[PDB]
Design a protein around this ligand. Structure first.
Ligand code: HEM
Ligand SMILES: CCOC(=O)C1=C(C)NC(C)=C(C(=O)OC)[C@H]1c1cccc(Cl)c1Cl
Ligand SMILES: CCCCCCCCCCCCCCCC(=O)O
Length: 463
């Protein structure tokens, strides 16, 4: 007894009824007819959609174990092979994630904290921006280099110089693969596997980049193996290699070189383009809202000053900036459909029964835009996370990282990168628009797995 939904056509399901360019819009329209929980078919594949806070919470949190599975696809299994953290399930997922979470703690990988790595990067970032000489530029590239380098310093210990060719090509490959995987065409191909044959060049391009990135990570890990100091872990790779030694006797161990390469790649995949996009969107919203930027820079002046680089301790004394960062994530709505889940067993949800392995879609965007929790949800307003006295007001509806047992495995790092990159940038620069601010639109242009802000130019004027 699956939840009701639009009547599917024999082979293509409800595909012709949904806009592949803005699936969330189609799902939202369906919730107005069928309610908070409904079933749609993409080809022969059923997908139960959860719309609204009550439905999303009950699924991801109150029935967390049952809803902790990762909804997989033919393309995912072909790229990852079920290795790593993003696309794995069962025992492998639990072990790799548990380890990943503990080593991604601020001091979970040695004497050097993750925060110190992000601060060094925030510093290198402001220096690259100074080289633009306050002239108009598309910040896309420079803003993408920082989060990528953060992951690099987290897994390879040392960051790369921005001019390093190995860094440049490594970044271009992840960029190429991101663009292909962000296309509405992958939705069609995942549900109609035969159509993948209609894209030989793209298929080969993706496979090639994954192969090259794989061998690169493997060359890096071999370097770590021949210089490992068990008492002094330098990064993520050292920690994994140390765990592998402790599990050397057990042959049914998930901690092997195969899962290590996949996990490192996954951190890059899940942590580079997502943070980069939020950083771009953030600067766009700050550019468009001068009044908001001013109050943030004022709070920075008061709590941090002009002679010291910001740090995470400062966030506790900067409620407005915290509210701004939260509002940037709520408004930007990066992953509107969330990442697909799958129930681990036959699950009972209210008066419905969802069979094992069925794909789950918890609409994060429907929570982020709840019109009661956030009056006027389509307006960017830091007040949505501020109380009557200007203090930070937390929200149960703040789910940009999803919720439950599968919530973003790098949420702390993500929030840290956002707070630090934005405060360090605004401490050293003012944001100038080329044209009039009225002409600047902030509505997301594309919505296919990852919502992207419109293209824009900006001038970084040193304070
Ligand atoms: C502002 C940027 C980011 C946002 C909004 C974000 C969002 C999310 C979301 C919505 C998911 C899917 C959760 C689910 O399964 O329901 C996810 C998963 C994940 N995130 Fe992030 N993320 C970001 C950055 C990071 C960073 C910096 C890292 C790197 C350590 C990272 C690592 C992961 C991983 C490994 C997963 C998969 C977890 C699993 O399957 O168990 N993310 N993230
Ligand atoms: C930012 C790029 O993310 C991806 O390319 C994803 C992959 C490799 N796989 C799947 C299953 C994803 C998806 O369908 O998202 C809707 C993403 C992904 C994985 C983990 C975290 C995030 Cl935020 C994303 Cl977008
Ligand atoms: C080994 C992994 C194989 C993965 C194969 C994935 C195939 C995806 C095909 C996507 C086609 C994208 C077309 C984009 C068109 C455009 O906008 O220019």
């Amino acid at each position: 007894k699956l939840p009701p939904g639009p009547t599917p056509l024999p082979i293509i399901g409800n595909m012709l009824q949904i806009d592949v360019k803005d699936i969330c819009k189609s799902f939202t329209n369906f919730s107005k007819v069928y309610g908070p929980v409904f079933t749609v078919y993409f080809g022969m594949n059923p997908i139960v959609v959860f719309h609204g806070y009550e439905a999303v919470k009950e699924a991801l949190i109150d029935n967390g174990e049952e809803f902790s599975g990762r909804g997989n696809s033919p393309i995912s299994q072909r790229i990852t092979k079920g290795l790593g953290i993003i696309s794995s399930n069962g025992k492998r997922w639990k072990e790799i994630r548990r380890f990943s979470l503990t080593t991604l703690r601020n001091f979970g990988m040695g004497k050097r904290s993750i925060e110190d790595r992000v601060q060094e990067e925030a510093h290198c970032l402001v220096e690259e921006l100074r080289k633009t000489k306050a002239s108009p530029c598309d910040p896309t590239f420079i803003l993408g280099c920082a989060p990528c380098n953060v992951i690099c310093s987290v897994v390879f210990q040392k960051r790369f110089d921005y001019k390093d060719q190995n860094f440049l090509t490594l970044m271009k490959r992840f960029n190429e693969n991101f663009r292909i995987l962000n296309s509405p065409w992958i939705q069609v191909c995942n549900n109609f596997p035969l159509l993948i044959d209609c894209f030989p060049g793209t298929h080969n391009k993706v496979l090639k980049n994954v192969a090259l990135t794989r061998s690169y990570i493997r060359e890096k890990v071999k370097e770590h193996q021949a210089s490992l100091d068990v008492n002094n872990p330098r990064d993520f790779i050292d920690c994994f290699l140390i765990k592998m030694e402790q599990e050397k006797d057990n042959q049914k161990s998930e901690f092997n070189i195969e899962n290590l390469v996949g996990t490192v790649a996954d951190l890059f995949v899940a942590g580079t383009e997502t943070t980069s996009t939020t950083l771009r969107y953030g600067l766009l919203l700050l550019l468009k809202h001068p009044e908001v930027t001013a109050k943030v820079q004022e709070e920075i002046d008061h709590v941090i000053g002009r002679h010291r680089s910001p740090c995470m301790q400062d966030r506790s004394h900067m409620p407005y900036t915290d509210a701004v960062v939260h509002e940037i994530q709520r408004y930007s709505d990066l992953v509107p459909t969330g990442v697909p889940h799958a129930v681990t067993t036959d699950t009972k949800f209210r008066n419905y029964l969802i069979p094992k392995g069925t794909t789950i879609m918890a609409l994060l965007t429907s929570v982020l835009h709840d019109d009661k929790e956030f009056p006027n949800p389509n307006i960017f307003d830091p007040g949505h996370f501020l109380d009557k006295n200007g203090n930070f007001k937390k929200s149960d509806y703040f789910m940009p990282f999803s919720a439950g047992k599968r919530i973003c495995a790098g949420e702390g790092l993500a929030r840290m990168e956002l707070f630090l990159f934005l405060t360090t940038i605004l401490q050293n620069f003012n944001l100038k628009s080329v044209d009039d601010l009225k002409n600047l639109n902030t509505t997301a242009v594309t919505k296919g797995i990852v919502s992207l802000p419109p293209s824009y130019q900006i001038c970084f004027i040193p304070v």
